[PDB]
Coordinates of C-alpha atoms and ligand atoms in Angstrom, one line a residue:
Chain A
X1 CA 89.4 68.0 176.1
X2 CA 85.6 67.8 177.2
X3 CA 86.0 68.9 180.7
X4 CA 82.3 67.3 181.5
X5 CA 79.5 64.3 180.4
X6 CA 76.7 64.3 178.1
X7 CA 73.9 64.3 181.0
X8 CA 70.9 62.4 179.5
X9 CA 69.4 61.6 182.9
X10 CA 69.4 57.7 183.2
X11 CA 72.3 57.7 180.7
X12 CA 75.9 59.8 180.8
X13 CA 77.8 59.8 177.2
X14 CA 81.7 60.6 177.5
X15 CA 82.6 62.9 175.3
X16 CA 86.9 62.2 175.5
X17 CA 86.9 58.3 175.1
X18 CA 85.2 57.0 171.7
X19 CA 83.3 58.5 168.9
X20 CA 79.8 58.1 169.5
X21 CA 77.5 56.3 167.1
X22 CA 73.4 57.5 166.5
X23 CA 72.0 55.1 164.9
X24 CA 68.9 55.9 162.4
X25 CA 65.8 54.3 163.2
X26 CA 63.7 54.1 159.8
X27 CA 60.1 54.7 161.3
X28 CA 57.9 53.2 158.2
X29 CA 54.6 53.7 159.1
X30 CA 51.7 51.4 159.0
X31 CA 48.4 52.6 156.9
X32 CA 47.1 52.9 159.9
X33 CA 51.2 52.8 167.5
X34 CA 50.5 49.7 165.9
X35 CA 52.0 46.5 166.1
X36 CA 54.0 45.7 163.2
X37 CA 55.5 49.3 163.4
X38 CA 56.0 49.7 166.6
X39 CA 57.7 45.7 167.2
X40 CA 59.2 46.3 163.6
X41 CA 61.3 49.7 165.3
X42 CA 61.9 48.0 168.2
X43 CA 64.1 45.0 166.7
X44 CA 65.5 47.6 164.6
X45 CA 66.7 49.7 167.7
X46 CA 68.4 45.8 169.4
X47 CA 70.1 45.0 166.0
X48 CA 71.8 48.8 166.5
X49 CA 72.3 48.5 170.0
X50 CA 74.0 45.3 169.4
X51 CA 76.0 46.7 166.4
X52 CA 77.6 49.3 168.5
X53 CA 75.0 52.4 168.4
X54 CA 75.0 54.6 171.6
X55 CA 72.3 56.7 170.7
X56 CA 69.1 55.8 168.8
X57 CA 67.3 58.7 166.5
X58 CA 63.8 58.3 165.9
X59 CA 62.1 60.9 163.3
X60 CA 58.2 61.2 162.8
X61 CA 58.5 63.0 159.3
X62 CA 61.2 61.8 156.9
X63 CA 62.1 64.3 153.9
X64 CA 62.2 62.7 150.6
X65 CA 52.3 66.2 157.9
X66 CA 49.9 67.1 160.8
X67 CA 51.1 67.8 164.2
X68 CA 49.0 65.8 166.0
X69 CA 49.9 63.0 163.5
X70 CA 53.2 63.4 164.6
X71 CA 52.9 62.5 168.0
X72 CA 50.8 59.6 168.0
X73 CA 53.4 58.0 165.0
X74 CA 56.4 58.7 167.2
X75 CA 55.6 58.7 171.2
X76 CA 54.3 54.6 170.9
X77 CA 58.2 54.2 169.1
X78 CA 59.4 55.9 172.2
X79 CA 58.0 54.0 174.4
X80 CA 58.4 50.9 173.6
X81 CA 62.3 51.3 172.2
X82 CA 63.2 53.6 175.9
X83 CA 61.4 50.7 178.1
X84 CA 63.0 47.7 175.6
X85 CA 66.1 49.1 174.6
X86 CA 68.7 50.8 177.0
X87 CA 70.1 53.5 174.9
X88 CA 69.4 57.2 174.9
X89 CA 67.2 58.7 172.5
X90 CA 67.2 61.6 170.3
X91 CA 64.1 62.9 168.8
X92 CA 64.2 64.2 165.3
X93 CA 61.5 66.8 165.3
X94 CA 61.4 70.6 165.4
X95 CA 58.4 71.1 166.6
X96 CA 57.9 72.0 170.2
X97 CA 54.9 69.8 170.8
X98 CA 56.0 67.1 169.2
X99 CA 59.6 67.5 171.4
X100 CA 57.6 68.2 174.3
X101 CA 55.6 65.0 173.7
X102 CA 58.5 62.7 173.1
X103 CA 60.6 63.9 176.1
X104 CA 57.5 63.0 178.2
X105 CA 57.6 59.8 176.2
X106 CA 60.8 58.9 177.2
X107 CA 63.0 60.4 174.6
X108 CA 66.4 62.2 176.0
X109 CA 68.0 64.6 173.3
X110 CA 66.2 66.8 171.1
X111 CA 67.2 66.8 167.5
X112 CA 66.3 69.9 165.7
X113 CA 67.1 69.9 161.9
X114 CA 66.5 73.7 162.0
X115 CA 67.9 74.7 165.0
X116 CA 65.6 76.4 167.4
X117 CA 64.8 78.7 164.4
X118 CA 61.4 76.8 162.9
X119 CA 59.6 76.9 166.3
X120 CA 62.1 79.4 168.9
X121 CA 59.7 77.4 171.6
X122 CA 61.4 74.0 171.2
X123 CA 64.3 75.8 172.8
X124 CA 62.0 76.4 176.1
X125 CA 61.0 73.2 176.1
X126 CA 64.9 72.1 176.2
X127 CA 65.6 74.5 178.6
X128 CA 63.0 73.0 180.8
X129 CA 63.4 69.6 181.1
X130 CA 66.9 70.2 181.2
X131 CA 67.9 67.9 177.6
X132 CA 70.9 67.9 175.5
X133 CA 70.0 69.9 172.1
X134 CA 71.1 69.1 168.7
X135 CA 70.8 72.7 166.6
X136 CA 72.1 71.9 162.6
X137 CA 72.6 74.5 160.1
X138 CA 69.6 75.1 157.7
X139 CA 68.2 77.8 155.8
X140 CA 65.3 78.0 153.5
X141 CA 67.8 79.7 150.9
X142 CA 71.3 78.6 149.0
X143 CA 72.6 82.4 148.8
X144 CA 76.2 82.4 150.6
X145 CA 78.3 85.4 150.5
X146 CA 80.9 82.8 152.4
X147 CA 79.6 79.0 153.1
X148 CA 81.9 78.8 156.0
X149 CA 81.7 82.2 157.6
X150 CA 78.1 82.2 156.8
X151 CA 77.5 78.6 158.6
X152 CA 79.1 79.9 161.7
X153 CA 76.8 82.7 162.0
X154 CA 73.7 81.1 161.2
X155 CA 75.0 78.4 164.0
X156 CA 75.6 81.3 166.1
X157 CA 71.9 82.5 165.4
X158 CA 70.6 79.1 166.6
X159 CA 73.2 79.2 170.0
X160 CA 71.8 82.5 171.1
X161 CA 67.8 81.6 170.2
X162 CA 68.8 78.5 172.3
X163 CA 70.8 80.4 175.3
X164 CA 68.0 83.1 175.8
X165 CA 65.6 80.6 176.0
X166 CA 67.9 79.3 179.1
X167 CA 69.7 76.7 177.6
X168 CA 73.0 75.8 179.5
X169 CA 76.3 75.7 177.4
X170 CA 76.4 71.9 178.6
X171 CA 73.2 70.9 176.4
X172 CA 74.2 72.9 173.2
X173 CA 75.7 70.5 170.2
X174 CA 75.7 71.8 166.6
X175 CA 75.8 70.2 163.6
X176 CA 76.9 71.6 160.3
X177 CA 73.8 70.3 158.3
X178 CA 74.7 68.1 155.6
X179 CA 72.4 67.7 153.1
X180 CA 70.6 71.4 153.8
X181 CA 70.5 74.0 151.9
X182 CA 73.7 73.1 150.0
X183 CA 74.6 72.4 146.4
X184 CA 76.9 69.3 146.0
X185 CA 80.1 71.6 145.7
X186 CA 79.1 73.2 149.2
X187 CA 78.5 69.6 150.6
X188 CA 81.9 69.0 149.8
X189 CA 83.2 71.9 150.7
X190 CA 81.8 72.2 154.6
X191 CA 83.5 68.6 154.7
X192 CA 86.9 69.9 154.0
X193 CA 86.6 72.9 156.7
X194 CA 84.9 70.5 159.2
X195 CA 87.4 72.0 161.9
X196 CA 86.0 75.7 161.8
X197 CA 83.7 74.8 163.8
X198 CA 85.2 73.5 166.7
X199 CA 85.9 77.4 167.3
X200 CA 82.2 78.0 168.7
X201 CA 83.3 75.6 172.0
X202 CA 80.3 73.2 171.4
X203 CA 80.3 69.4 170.1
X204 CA 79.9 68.6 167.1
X205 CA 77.4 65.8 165.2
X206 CA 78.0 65.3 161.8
X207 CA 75.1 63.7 159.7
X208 CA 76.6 62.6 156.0
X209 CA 75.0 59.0 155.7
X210 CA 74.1 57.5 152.2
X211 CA 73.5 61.5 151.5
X212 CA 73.0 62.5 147.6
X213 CA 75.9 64.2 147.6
X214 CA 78.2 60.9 148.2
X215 CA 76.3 59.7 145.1
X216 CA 77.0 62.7 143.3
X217 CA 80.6 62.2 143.8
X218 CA 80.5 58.7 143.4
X219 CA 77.8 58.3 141.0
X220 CA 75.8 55.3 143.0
X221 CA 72.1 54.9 144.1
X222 CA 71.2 54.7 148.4
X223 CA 71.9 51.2 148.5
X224 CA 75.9 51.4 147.3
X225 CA 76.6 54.3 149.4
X226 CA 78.4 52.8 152.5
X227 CA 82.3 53.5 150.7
X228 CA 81.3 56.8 150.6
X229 CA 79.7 57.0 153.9
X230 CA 82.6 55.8 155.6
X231 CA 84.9 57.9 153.9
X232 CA 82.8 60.8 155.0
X233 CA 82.5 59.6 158.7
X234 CA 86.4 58.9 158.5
X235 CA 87.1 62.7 157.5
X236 CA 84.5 63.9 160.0
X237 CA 86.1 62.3 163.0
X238 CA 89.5 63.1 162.2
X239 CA 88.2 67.1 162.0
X240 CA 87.1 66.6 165.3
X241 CA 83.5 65.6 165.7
X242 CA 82.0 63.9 168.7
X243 CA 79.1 62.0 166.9
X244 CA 78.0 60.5 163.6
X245 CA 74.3 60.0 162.6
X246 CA 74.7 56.9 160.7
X247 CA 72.1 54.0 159.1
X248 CA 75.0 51.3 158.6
X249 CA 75.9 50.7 162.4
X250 CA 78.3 47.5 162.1
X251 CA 80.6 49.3 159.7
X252 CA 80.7 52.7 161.2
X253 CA 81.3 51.7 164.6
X254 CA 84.4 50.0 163.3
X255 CA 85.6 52.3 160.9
X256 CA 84.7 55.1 164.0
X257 CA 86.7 53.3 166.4
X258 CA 90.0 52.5 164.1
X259 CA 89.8 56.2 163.4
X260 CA 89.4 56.7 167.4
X261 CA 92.5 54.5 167.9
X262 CA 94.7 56.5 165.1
X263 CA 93.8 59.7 165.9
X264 CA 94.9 59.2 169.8
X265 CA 90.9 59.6 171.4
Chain B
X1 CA 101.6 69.8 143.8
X2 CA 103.7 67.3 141.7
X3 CA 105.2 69.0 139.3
X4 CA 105.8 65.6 137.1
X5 CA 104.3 62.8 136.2
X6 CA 104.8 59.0 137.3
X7 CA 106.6 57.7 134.6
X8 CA 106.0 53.6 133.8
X9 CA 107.5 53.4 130.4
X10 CA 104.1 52.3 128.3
X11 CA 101.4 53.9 131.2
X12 CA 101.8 57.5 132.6
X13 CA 100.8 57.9 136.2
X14 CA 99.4 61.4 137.3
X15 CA 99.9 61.9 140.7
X16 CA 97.7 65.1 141.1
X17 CA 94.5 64.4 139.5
X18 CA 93.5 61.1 142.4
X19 CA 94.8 58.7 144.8
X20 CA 96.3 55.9 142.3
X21 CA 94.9 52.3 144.1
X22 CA 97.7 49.3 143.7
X23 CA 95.8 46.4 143.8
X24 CA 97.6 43.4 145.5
X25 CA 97.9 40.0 143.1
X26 CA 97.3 36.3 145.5
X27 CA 99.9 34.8 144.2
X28 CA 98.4 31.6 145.4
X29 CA 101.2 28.6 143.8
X30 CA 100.3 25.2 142.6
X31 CA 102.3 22.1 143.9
X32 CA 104.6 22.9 141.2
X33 CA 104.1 28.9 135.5
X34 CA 101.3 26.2 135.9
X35 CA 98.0 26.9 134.2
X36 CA 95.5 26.9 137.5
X37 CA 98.5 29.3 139.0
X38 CA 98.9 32.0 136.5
X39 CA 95.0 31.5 134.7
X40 CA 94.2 32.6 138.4
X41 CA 96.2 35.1 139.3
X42 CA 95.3 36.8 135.3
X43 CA 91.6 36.4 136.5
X44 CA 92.3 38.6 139.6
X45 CA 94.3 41.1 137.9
X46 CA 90.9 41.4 135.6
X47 CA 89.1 41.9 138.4
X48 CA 91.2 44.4 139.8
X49 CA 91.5 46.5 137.0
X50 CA 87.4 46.2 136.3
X51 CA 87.1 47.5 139.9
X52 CA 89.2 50.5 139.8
X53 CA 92.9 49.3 140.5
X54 CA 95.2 51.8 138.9
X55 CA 98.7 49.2 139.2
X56 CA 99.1 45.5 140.2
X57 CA 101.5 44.2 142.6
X58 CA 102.4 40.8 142.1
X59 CA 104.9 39.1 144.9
X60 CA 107.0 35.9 144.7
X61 CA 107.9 35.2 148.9
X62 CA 104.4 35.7 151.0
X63 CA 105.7 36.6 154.4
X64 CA 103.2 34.8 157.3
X65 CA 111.9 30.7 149.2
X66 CA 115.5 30.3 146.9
X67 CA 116.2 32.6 144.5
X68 CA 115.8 30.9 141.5
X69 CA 112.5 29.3 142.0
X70 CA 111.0 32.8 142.9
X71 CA 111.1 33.9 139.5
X72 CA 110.5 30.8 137.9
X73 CA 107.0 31.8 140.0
X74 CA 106.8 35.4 139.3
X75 CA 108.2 35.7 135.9
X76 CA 105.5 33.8 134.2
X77 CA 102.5 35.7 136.0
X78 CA 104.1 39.1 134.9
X79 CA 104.1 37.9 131.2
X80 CA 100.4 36.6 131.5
X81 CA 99.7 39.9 133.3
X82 CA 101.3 42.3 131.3
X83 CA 100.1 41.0 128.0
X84 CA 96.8 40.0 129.3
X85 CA 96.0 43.6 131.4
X86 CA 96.9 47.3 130.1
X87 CA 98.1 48.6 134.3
X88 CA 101.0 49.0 135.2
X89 CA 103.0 46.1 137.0
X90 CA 105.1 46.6 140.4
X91 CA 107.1 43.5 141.1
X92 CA 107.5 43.0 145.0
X93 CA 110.8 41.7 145.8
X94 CA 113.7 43.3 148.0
X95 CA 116.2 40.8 145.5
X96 CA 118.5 42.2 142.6
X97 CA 118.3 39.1 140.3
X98 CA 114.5 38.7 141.1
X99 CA 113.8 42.1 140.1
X100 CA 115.7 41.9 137.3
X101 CA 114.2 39.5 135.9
X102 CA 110.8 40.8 136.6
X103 CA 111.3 44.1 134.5
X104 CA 112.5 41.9 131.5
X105 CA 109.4 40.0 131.9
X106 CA 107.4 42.9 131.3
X107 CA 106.9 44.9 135.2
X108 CA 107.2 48.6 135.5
X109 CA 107.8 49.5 139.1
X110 CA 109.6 47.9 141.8
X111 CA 108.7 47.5 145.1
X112 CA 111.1 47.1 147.6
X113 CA 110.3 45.9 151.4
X114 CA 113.5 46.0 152.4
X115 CA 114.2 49.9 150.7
X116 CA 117.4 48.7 149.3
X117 CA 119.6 47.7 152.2
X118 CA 118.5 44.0 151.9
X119 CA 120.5 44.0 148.6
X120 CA 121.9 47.3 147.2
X121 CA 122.4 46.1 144.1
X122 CA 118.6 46.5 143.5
X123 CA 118.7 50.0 143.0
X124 CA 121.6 49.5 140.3
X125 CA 119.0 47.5 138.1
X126 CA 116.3 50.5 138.9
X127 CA 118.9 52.9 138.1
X128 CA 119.5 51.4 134.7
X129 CA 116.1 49.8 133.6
X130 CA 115.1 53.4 134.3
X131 CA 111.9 52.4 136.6
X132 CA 110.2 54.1 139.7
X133 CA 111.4 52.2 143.1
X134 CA 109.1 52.3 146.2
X135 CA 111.5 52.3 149.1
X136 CA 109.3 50.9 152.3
X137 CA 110.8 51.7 155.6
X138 CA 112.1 48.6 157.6
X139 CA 114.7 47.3 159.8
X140 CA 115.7 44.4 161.3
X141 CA 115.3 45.6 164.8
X142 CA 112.6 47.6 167.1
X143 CA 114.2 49.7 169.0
X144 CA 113.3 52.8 168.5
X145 CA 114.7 56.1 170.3
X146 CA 111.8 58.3 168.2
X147 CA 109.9 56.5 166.1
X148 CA 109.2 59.0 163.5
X149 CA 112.4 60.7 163.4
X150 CA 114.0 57.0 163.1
X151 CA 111.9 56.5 160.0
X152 CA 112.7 59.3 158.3
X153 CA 116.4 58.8 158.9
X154 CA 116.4 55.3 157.9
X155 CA 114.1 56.2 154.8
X156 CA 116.8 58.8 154.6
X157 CA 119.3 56.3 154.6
X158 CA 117.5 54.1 151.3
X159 CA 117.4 56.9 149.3
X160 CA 120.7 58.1 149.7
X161 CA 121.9 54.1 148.7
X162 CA 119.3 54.7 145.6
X163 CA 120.5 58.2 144.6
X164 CA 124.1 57.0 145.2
X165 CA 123.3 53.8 142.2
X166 CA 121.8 56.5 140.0
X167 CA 118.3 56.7 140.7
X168 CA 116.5 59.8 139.7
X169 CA 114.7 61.9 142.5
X170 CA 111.6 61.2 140.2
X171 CA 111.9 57.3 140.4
X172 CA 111.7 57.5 143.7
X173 CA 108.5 56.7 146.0
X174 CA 108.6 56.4 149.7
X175 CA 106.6 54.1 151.5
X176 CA 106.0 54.3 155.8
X177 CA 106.3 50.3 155.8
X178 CA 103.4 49.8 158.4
X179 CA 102.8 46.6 160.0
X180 CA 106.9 46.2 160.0
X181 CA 109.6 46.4 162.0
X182 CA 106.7 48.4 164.7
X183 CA 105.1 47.1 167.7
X184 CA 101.1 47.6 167.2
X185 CA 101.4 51.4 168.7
X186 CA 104.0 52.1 166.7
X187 CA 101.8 51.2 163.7
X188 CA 99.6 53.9 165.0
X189 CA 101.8 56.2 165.8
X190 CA 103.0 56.0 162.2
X191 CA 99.5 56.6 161.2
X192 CA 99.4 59.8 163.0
X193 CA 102.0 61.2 161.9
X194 CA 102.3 60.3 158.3
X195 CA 102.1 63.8 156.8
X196 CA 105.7 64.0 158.3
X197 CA 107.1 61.6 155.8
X198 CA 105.8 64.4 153.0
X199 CA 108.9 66.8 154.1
X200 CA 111.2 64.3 152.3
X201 CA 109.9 65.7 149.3
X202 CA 108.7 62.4 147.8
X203 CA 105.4 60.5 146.9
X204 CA 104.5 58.2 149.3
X205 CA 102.3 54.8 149.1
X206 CA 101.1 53.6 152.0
X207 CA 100.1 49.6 152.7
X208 CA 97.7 48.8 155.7
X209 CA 95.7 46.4 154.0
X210 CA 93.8 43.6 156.3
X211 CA 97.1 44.0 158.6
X212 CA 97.8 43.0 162.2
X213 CA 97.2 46.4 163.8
X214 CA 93.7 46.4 162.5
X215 CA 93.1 43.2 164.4
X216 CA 94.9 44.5 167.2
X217 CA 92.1 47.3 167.8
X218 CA 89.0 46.0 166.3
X219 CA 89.7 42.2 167.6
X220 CA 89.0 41.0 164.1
X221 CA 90.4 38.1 162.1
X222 CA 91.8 39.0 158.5
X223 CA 88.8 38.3 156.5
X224 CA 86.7 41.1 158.8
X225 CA 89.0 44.0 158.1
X226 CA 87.3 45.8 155.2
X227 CA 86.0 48.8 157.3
X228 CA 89.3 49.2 159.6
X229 CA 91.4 48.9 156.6
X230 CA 88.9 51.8 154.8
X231 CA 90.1 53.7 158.1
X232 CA 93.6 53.7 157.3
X233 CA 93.2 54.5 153.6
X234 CA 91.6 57.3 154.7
X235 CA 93.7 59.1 157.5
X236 CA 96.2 58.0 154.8
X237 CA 94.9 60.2 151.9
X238 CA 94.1 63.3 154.2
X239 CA 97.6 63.1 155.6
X240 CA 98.8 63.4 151.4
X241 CA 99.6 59.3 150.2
X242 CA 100.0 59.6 146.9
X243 CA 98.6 55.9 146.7
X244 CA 97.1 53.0 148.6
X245 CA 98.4 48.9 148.4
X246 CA 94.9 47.0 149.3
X247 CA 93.3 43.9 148.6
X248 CA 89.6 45.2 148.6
X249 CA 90.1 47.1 145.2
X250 CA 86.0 47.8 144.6
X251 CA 85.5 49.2 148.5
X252 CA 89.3 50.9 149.0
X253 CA 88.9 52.5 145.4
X254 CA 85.3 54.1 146.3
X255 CA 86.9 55.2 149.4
X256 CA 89.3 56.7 147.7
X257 CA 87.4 58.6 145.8
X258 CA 85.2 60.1 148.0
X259 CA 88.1 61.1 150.2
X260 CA 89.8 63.1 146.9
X261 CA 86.7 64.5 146.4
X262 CA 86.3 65.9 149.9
X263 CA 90.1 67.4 150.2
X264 CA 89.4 68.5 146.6
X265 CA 92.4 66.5 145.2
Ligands
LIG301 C1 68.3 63.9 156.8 C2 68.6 63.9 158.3 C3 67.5 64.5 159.2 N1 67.9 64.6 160.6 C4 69.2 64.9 160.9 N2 69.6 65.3 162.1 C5 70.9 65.8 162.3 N3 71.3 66.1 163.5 N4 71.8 65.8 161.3 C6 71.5 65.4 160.0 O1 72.4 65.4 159.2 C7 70.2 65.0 159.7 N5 69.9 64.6 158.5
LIG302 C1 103.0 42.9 153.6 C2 103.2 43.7 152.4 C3 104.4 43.4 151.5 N1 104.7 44.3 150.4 C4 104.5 45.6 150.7 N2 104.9 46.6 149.8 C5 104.8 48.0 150.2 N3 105.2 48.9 149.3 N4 104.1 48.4 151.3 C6 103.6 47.5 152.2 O1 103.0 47.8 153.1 C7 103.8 46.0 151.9 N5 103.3 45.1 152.8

């Protein structure tokens, strides 16, 4: 079905053979590139390495901050989990600089929560050093005419921002944005039509972990949100997606790779 | 979708509104109705029904037994049960007498490994007690020429031996029978293809709890199954099981849940 590799310069990801697993790495900061920060993200990064992760994602500003902040919270994490930890590494910024910094860094995907559409430039700097680019659906509005329909053109929006900018078809994976700009019913409902976008020819990452809208459904806090997660990640592989952005690493690698051995990939 | 409801004399089961959980009893016996035997096995139905189980299964013969002594076993855990928790009770024997038995002790559904050919007679007491019968695919044998097609005929063939004793299309539940009478690809291959089973026209449960197969891909003894058993619950519900036989009620049911939530059942 994937008729190449995931280049990510020292590392290749196959695409046909296993779900892959990006594992979160929960950057709390220090009041204050220091130690415990820096060492506390680096064990982090081995337990999910050892759990089953093939990618780590490290983010500089978690939604629940200065540019310049940015990079000096995020390129020591780099750093030390790229020289200490042989995995690739996604960073979750959408900022050009702060890509452009990371990537120097050592980091080897960029992960753009608002595909190429916050800062168009963070496409360029993809396009130049040549790194596989996640683009997810956002908008800074709720208003859909059709969720679906309107998904895939917004996507589409972020593939051509990307592709002008001279990124090849090769570094282009999309992400239907779970969690953005979505009421819980919409949540659900990109969920259930999954496989619509598997039309646009591009990989799919689907990011659903301990999300509000699995404790909407199910009516639990963060912490009792890994039923739902699963269930999620389950339904997500079987539409056909190539990675999950996950926190719970041990139980999503093995719920991944029984759905991996079901499913026939 | 169903056009009726399940019928269990005192409890309705509506098969529309979610994916109904069947909650396995350990039917763990004492060297000898014993108090530490059926105090025990009333404790777990308890705890079943607190964590979301919708029907309790309790079994005499633990495949890993005369006829007689198997209900002197399962007889007095169905009163205790019965009178004790408001869920329906299935009774999981393939034998006439047993089951007979059973129902006059107070069970509502039968479930039958052997879908009626180990003892035809079964379906006679279904037939007259009036009860829904799950008919669970095995054989005595593994050679298949098509797997799937050689379920469905041999499914076929239980309810034809059902229908023929006077069991009504609506007491009738059909169940794949995975970890049975399949090598561990055939168990996966049944997995797959489940939504065929749904052209027979009938509900279907489907058991995968903790099983073999699991092992067989994760390389994981019994007690570290919870997440590849989740797996198979859910390709199960998306491929349409009307209901799901598991040990892990709180996790499986959550699961569940989520999953009906998602396909909008
Ligand atoms: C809340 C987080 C932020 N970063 C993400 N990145 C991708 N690709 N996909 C996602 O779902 C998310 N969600
Ligand atoms: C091992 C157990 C025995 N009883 C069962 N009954 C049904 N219906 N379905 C099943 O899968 C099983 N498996």
């Amino acid at each position: 079905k994937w008729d190449y590799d995931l280049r990510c310069g020292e590392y290749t990801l196959n695409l046909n053979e296993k779900t892959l697993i990006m594992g979160i790495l929960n950057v709390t900061p220090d009041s204050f590139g220091s130690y415990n920060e820096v060492d506390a993200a680096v064990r982090h990064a081995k337990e999910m390495r050892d759990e089953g992760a093939h990618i780590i994602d490290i983010g500089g500003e978690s939604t629940r901050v200065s540019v310049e902040e940015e990079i000096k919270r995020v390129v020591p994490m780099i750093q030390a989990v790229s020289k200490e930890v042989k995995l690739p590494i996604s960073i979750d910024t959408y900022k050009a600089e702060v890509a452009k910094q990371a990537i120097e860094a050592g980091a080897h995907i960029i992960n753009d929560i608002w595909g190429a559409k916050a800062e168009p430039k963070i496409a360029e700097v993809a396009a130049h050093y040549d790194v596989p680019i996640i683009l997810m659906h956002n908008r800074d509005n709720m208003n859909y005419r059709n969720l679906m329909a309107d998904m895939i053109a917004d996507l589409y929006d972020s593939i051509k921002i990307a592709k002008d900018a001279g990124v090849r078809d090769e570094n282009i994976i999309l992400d239907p944005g779970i969690g953005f700009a979505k009421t819980p019913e919409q949540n659900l409902e990109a969920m259930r039509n999954l496989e619509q976008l598997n039309v646009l020819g591009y990989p799919v990452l689907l990011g659903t972990s301990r999300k509000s809208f699995i404790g909407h459904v199910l009516d639990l806090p963060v912490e009792e949100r890994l039923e739902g997660t699963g269930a999620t990640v389950c339904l997500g592989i079987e539409k056909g997606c190539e990675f999950v952005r996950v926190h719970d690493v041990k139980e999503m690698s093995r719920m991944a790779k029984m759905m991996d051995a079901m499913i026939g990939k």
